[PDB]
Amino acid sequence: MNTVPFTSAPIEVTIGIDQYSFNVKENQPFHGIKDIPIGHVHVIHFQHADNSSMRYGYWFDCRMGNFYIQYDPKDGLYKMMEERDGAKFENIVHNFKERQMMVSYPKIDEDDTWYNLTEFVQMDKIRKIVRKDENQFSYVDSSMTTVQENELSDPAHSLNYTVINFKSREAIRPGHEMEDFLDKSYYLNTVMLQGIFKNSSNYFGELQFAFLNAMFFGNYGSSLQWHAMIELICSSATVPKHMLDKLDEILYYQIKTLPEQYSDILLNERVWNICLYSSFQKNSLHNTEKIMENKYPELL
Amino acid sequence: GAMNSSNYAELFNNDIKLFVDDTNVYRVTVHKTFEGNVATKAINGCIFTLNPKTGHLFLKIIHTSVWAGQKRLSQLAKWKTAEEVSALVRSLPKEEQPKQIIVTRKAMLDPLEVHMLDFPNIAIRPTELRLPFSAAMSIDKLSDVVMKATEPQMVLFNIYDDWLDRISSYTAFSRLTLLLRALKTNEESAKMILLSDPTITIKSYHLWPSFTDEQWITIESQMRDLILTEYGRKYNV
């Protein structure tokens, strides 16, 4: 069980850790989050009480180093940092725990939600989508644009999601125009799975990461990426049976977890209606179709 | 974006552009079977690809053999159209390639865009205009070459005959759309108007009769009258 200590909480802020969140008051004696489950990526995220604009946060894995949060009054945000001195860090964490100034990661034992949302998500893959190689953790916020959004402006602060474009030479073999446009199996299986992602695990990892960025930061480009990766599978007539069964589970937990009130901005009507009712895979996402029909029948 | 009443004059500027109409690509007769079910028999069709500035018509004849053993033909017809237009563009010298292709039907946008990925600088555009190019098969000489085709064939016409010697492209296109609109609304009446005077003939190398400027004014008046009558009837106004 790992710990992310906070030096202090000088400004009033809603702090999220994965799907959980806590209101902290200005100069409240808050010194961090303990009992963080080892074996998963995590995200610690912020929304200032004074600017409900810019949700921002940090993807990390406690196995990769000792991370803490410290408010920077110049840049005006909570920053993640690595403590390289193991003894200084254990000494800081033991003190804060003794004084019970830390919240406990509030995992219910029965609850596999976070595992289910992060099953394929790997810190090494996150660090290639979010490039800042001098840190072991990854900063994401509401406003960061994707490589694809930039093509259609600061590349240092971009989300480098795999570009998916259904009307591209990459997606359409010369001489198979109609076949490849109506059945995207060659784009999914040869270009994307065999070619770029290497396996379905890396593909699902980026799909899950895009969803979580959309949900936790309202990152519009991430939402575009999540939908494109869903639509590429559902629009393929030929998908490995293990991929369809896994996609149904992945989407089920994403829809289950989404705030009921955010369905209007985070869910693309055309993609979902196409995927559940028209696509080749219309009959292959039973759990996802059942949760969508019972939770968001308006959207459909 | 979309071609409409507002940006009409763009059709007659010096940027090469083509209209593509796919209406007559997939043509069928519907009939009863012996068992009293319904079946279709395909007949020869055509792609109507027109330079509205020059009058050059690229009439790609679609022989019924292209449908043999194919499913979902009304869908295939859009992709076959897009394949043939793309092949036409690739066959033209660079300085003759269009800068824009305007499709008369929005269902052609995706098929044409995907076939033209090699030409990212050629803009594929819809139109808000209700163009009567479906009536091309009411032009006797175009109908004759489509129906006689025994194989895929491209036939080149000037749909304006020699009009551009006397009138502007704008005026030539207005006359063409008025003739086709008439032929579309009441073919029998429209064709009666065009041939009633046996002294006015169609040259072997032309599609329409050899009217004087004065006779075109009378003809154009008779076509407008035909169209408004039919409108009152259609609608009871």
Side-chain angles (χ1 to χ4, degrees), chain A residues 1-151 154-300, chain B residues 1-235:
Chain A
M1 300 316 266
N2 276 108
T3 305
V4 171
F6 279 52
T7 298
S8 61
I11 74 158
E12 189 162 297
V13 61
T14 305
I15 305 174
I17 172 77
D18 303 345
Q19 75 265 36
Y20 310 107
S21 73
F22 309 102
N23 298 319
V24 174
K25 298 303 171 276
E26 174 191 281
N27 285 319
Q28 183 182 327
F30 176 87
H31 294 280
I33 306 168
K34 64 180 197 177
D35 307 327
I36 302 168
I38 308 176
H40 307 120
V41 305
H42 295 287
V43 60
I44 185 166
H45 47 102
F46 301 95
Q47 184 150 236
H48 297 183
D50 74 352
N51 188 225
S52 108
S53 293
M54 190 178 55
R55 279 176 279 161
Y56 68 96
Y58 307 90
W59 290 96
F60 67 96
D61 181 336
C62 283
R63 295 176 281 192
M64 283 167 73
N66 300 305
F67 308 112
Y68 67 102
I69 299 291
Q70 186 168 104
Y71 186 68
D72 172 9
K74 180 168 166 77
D75 289 345
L77 83 180
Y78 291 98
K79 298 199 163 165
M80 185 159 280
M81 292 190 281
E82 185 168 353
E83 181 50 79
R84 77 156 294 113
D85 189 349
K88 185 175 186 182
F89 186 81
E90 290 159 15
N91 168 235
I92 285 309
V93 168
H94 171 268
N95 170 81
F96 281 154
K97 281 195 187 185
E98 270 297 274
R99 308 232 289 150
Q100 300 188 44
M101 297 277 103
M102 302 198 179
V103 290
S104 181
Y105 186 99
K107 200 189 158 302
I108 303 327
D109 313 315
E110 175 191 34
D111 175 54
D112 265 351
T113 296
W114 189 246
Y115 171 79
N116 291 335
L117 292 166
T118 60
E119 181 166 356
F120 298 100
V121 179
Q122 300 283 1
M123 210 49 237
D124 73 282
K125 297 313 207 292
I126 291 177
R127 297 182 73 247
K128 297 175 209 306
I129 295 161
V130 190
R131 315 192 158 289
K132 195 180 206 226
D133 294 319
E134 70 269 25
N135 296 332
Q136 299 279 292
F137 50 83
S138 299
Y139 171 91
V140 180
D141 68 27
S142 294
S143 74
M144 285 165 61
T145 55
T146 75
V147 154
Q148 176 167 64
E149 283 180 312
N150 292 340
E151 293 175 343
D154 187 29
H157 220 60
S158 288
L159 297 170
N160 303 275
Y161 293 121
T162 300
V163 177
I164 297 173
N165 174 4
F166 297 138
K167 298 190 292 188
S168 74
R169 178 50 66 221
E170 294 65 41
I172 307 287
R173 283 175 300 178
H176 306 252
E177 284 80 3
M178 177 183 195
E179 165 183 32
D180 282 353
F181 183 73
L182 287 179
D183 175 7
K184 312 205 185 285
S185 297
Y186 186 80
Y187 190 38
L188 175 62
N189 294 304
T190 299
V191 181
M192 285 285 160
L193 284 177
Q194 171 169 292
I196 300 186
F197 283 101
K198 303 312 179 185
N199 57 59
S200 54
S201 292
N202 292 339
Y203 184 102
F204 289 142
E206 184 172 320
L207 183 156
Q208 292 184 305
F209 185 52
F211 170 78
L212 291 170
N213 286 328
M215 182 176 57
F216 288 124
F217 309 110
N219 188 273
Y220 175 79
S222 296
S223 185
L224 290 185
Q225 182 68 9
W226 175 56
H227 285 97
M229 298 190 76
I230 291 167
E231 186 170 3
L232 176 57
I233 291 170
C234 298
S235 294
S236 295
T238 305
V239 179
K241 310 77 161 61
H242 78 275
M243 266 191 72
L244 292 173
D245 287 330
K246 187 60 64 163
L247 177 64
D248 194 29
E249 290 306 310
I250 282 166
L251 296 182
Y252 173 80
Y253 285 100
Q254 289 170 339
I255 299 311
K256 178 169 169 55
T257 304
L258 267 185
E260 296 76 45
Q261 299 302 331
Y262 290 46
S263 56
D264 55 309
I265 46 172
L266 286 173
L267 293 180
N268 184 292
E269 180 178 288
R270 175 199 62 92
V271 168
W272 282 100
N273 277 284
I274 270 63
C275 290
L276 299 181
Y277 304 125
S278 312
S279 83
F280 291 106
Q281 305 305 341
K282 64 200 179 294
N283 291 333
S284 312
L285 305 174
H286 299 118
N287 295 347
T288 290
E289 182 171 297
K290 196 164 296 313
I291 193 173
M292 279 282 296
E293 287 187 352
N294 279 281
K295 188 175 183 200
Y296 299 123
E298 329 90 38
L299 196 90
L300 324 157
Chain B
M3 200 270 286
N4 55 38
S5 286
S6 297
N7 51 26
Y8 192 71
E10 190 171 5
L11 294 176
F12 315 112
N13 75 10
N14 289 102
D15 291 349
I16 300 169
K17 47 180 71 61
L18 294 174
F19 276 115
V20 170
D21 185 87
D22 68 312
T23 306
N24 286 306
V25 167
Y26 173 45
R27 296 212 284 163
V28 294
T29 59
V30 180
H31 63 89
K32 284 288 193 70
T33 69
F34 183 80
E35 294 81 18
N37 308 127
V38 171
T40 56
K41 190 191 154 293
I43 63 170
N44 288 347
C46 58
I47 309 166
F48 181 100
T49 300
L50 172 66
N51 185 329
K53 176 82 167 184
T54 64
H56 287 208
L57 173 62
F58 300 89
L59 195 77
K60 175 68 195 219
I61 302 177
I62 306 296
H63 188 258
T64 58
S65 64
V66 305
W67 312 128
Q70 308 294 329
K71 281 105 172 61
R72 293 185 59 73
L73 297 182
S74 65
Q75 172 193 82
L76 177 59
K78 300 173 200 323
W79 294 86
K80 177 57 174 192
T81 299
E83 181 184 357
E84 288 295 355
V85 166
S86 179
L88 169 61
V89 168
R90 289 167 214 276
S91 82
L92 290 166
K94 190 188 202 214
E95 63 277 9
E96 292 176 39
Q97 286 174 344
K99 292 124 208 166
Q100 300 177 11
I101 305 170
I102 310 158
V103 297
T104 59
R105 303 203 298 172
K106 302 191 200 68
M108 277 301 309
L109 288 164
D110 277 352
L112 193 55
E113 170 168 3
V114 167
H115 271 284
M116 299 290 290
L117 290 172
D118 288 339
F119 294 101
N121 294 344
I122 302 181
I124 307 304
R125 305 179 57 206
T127 183
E128 297 168 28
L129 300 180
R130 45 273 196 175
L131 293 163
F133 296 148
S134 72
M137 289 300 90
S138 299
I139 302 167
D140 288 322
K141 284 184 187 187
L142 304 186
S143 186
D144 286 347
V145 72
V146 168
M147 287 322 281
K148 293 196 219 300
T150 62
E151 41 186 322
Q153 191 183 348
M154 166 78 89
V155 186
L156 302 192
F157 296 89
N158 191 319
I159 201 156
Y160 296 155
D161 296 336
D162 64 347
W163 307 337
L164 294 184
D165 297 347
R166 302 194 62 77
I167 64 178
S168 65
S169 297
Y170 180 106
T171 304
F173 193 76
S174 306
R175 179 181 298 162
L176 174 65
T177 62
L178 171 67
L179 290 172
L180 287 176
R181 177 64 63 206
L183 288 159
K184 181 164 184 164
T185 318
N186 190 326
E187 188 177 35
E188 181 211 326
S189 295
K191 287 184 172 206
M192 281 174 61
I193 289 162
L194 286 169
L195 323 166
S196 56
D197 178 350
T199 75
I200 319 168
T201 64
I202 304 169
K203 296 294 146 295
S204 50
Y205 52 85
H206 282 170
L207 294 183
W208 314 98
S210 296
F211 291 119
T212 63
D213 295 5
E214 288 318 282
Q215 286 167 344
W216 266 126
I217 305 293
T218 299
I219 291 297
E220 286 169 337
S221 156
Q222 288 169 10
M223 294 298 192
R224 294 192 192 96
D225 293 343
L226 178 160
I227 294 162
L228 301 172
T229 306
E230 279 311 328
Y231 173 101
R233 199 206 181 290
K234 304 327 172 77
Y235 288 102

